[PDB]
């Protein structure tokens, strides 16, 4: 404990496997240090090539383990540092070690690959090209997952989620297809961490174009996502909500699967969740669902979710309120006249008008857009007057006319539009 770099270098350069082993172990402990671990000094000393060569000493499993751990400590730092480990030839060496008869050594290799793949798209794809996926999946090829050591199972799930991570580009379609069945199995495993990381992996794969959303949804995971959406553990709910949120940016049939799985019955509690980001992401998800078909809007109505949207619009973090505004504009643009009537009876007008005094230019356009849609529904019933009166009684015109002095063009036109058509002669 507490060796200098000079001494580690000296032991590692000796012609003595045991001396090298003690020095490597000393290096790992130094790199394990919590405050200010001298990763850059270790790299500057030229130790990484030597650590990588110790990975192949199949005759001396303890120096395999120490250098794996030392190297993983470097690889779990910055991108330059991870680059240094990769530049040392570590990826093939680590993939070879997945096959090691020592679980401790196999596990380090899993964690190493996880940190390398997790650093970015190019390294993720490099790990895949070196053929990491097959021996990783082979480590989970048992009849029942419960028979694997918990920490072992957690490390493998974490590493697979990293192979699913990042965009531009997203992972190769072939690799996603190869990984997905094991992922679906992990998503049914009873361990909070395995579930959380499985959820993350799904949320990564669903974060893109509808074809990738489809690859996931064809595998029947949506009912399991909805169940996880109801969990007590925030670290499961958070990625499950993200995945559900991604899926409803897809086609109407993809969205409908989310509704069919019973997802909307969880949203009264999500739209009032004490954690700001859950509530934000729930309202975003709602805005994509109110942008769907009229029968899908009708299910939002039937689950009693409209009062909850009115509530979030009335009081919430501003970014959440911005999402609720979108949910409303999407609802009003695609909704039937009866569905828009119902929205106004729930009390949408007053908190809609109040958000017109926000100095965020975009929410103003969104709200004015929704007001226009509601008037068009009112035009079909001849309640245009009652609507104008109602808007005027909560202070709507004060906010709408003051928006004519607004130094943004798109706002002013649509602002003046309204004052003219529904508040004149
Ligand atoms: C014309 N499409 C409108 C639409 C559909 C679906 C979602 C959103 C959205 C835009 C910005 C923030 N949140 C949600 C907007």
Author numbering: 74 to 498
Paper quotes:
Importin-α is a banana-shaped protein that is constructed from a series of 10 repeating structural motifs called armadillo repeats; it binds both the NLSs of nuclear import cargo proteins and TPX2 using sites on its inner concave surface. All NLSs bind to the major binding site, spanning armadillo repeats 1–4, and some also have a small additional contribution from the minor site, spanning repeats 6–8. TPX2, however, binds primarily to the minor site of importin-α, thereby offering an opportunity for selectivity. As the transport and mitotic roles of importin-α employ two different sites on the protein, the TPX2–importin-α interaction has potential as an anticancer target, provided selectivity for the minor site over the major site can be achieved.
Significantly, the co-crystal structure of importin-α with fragment 1 revealed difference density for the compound only in the minor site of importin-α with no significant density peaks in the major site, suggesting that the initial fragment demonstrated considerable site selectivity. Fragment 1 binds in the key minor site ‘hot spot’ positioned such that the pyridine nitrogen atom is within hydrogen bonding or salt-bridge distance (2.8 Å) of the carboxylate group of the defining minor site residue Glu396 (where the crucial arginine of TPX2 also forms interactions). The π–π stacking interaction between both rings of the fragment and the Trp399 indole results in a twist between the fragment aromatic rings with a torsion angle of 38°. Structural studies showed that, despite its low affinity, fragment 1 bound specifically in the minor site of importin-α at the key residue Glu396.
